[PDB]
Each structure stands twice: as C-alpha cells, then as structure tokens.
C-alpha cells in the first residue's frame, strides 16, 4: 500500500504542505528549490495514492567525509507505525549501499523526540552528539545528532 514517488514541480506544493504540518521548523523557498535538484535524494511517500510523508536529503562534505544528511524524514501522525518511515529510510540506505562512497548518514532531532530515537536506533543509528541550542524558536532547542556508519 506504500509507494515512494519522485518530487517534481507538479507535486512540490504537496511536499511543502506535509513538511509544514509534520515539522515545527519552517523552510525557505531555497530549501524546496534545492529539493528538485537532488534527484533520488528526495521522495514522497503515498499511502493508498494519498501523499502522507516525504524524505529530503543532501550530500554533505564535513569532518573530511562524504556524508548523507537527512534534512527531513516524516510521516503524517495518523499514518505512523504502518512502515512509511521504514520505506523512506530503506530507500536512502539502498541509495548509499549502491553508491558506495558515503562514509555515514546523519541527521538532527529534538532531544524530546523519543519516537525518532526509537525509529533510527532500530536501523543501527547512534546518538553521537547532543548539540545545545541547535533549534532557535522552539522548545526543546537542544538536538541529538544521530548517525549510522557505513
């Protein structure tokens, strides 16, 4: 019942709508312009042909490493615990497995996001750091950095 699809100018508004509802932090027009330029690093998740989730990633060059950073990976609350998040994460893991040049995958979550910690830790991710005041106008502002070594 869950299918992933490409992010295009035809459905980019549906992606902005999902991110607005799922994530307390707002993203600028440049974030969404860049999402159309990353290819397989951005997908929509459909539950019975309804768009209910999305994943947006970018390549990062930090720590003298080639890393895949997950900017947003989310699902609408009533559709949670159905495997949508797993479908999106396995897609990113598969891309990295086939690419073979990424050293690690990493992301940021609020320290209060127990469901996100639980989800990522099931895939081999570890909390490698806790960054104080990472988020600016929301509480908690502190964020864990979750990373999976490849």
């Amino acid at each position: 019942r869950i299918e992933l699809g490409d992010v295009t100018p035809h459905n980019i508004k549906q992606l902005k709508r999902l991110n607005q509802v799922i994530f307390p932090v707002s993203y600028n027009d440049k974030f969404y312009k860049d999402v159309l330029e990353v290819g397989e690093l951005a997908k929509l998740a459909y539950f019975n042909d309804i768009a209910v989730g999305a994943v947006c990633c970018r390549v990062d060059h930090s720590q003298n490493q080639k890393r895949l950073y997950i900017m947003t990976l989310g699902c609408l609350a009533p559709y949670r615990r159905l495997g949508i998040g797993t479908k999106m994460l396995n897609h990113v893991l598969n891309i990295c497995e086939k690419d073979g040049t990424f050293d690690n995958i990493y992301l940021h979550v609020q320290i209060s996001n127990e469901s996100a910690i639980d989800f990522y830790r099931k895939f081999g991710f570890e909390i490698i750091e806790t960054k104080k005041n990472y988020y600016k106008r929301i509480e908690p502002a502190d964020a864990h950095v979750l990373q999976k070594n490849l």
Partner: peptide
Amino acid sequence: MLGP
C-alpha cells in the same frame, strides 16, 4: 529535522 534541519535547523535553518
């Protein structure tokens, strides 16, 4: 969740 990226913090922009």
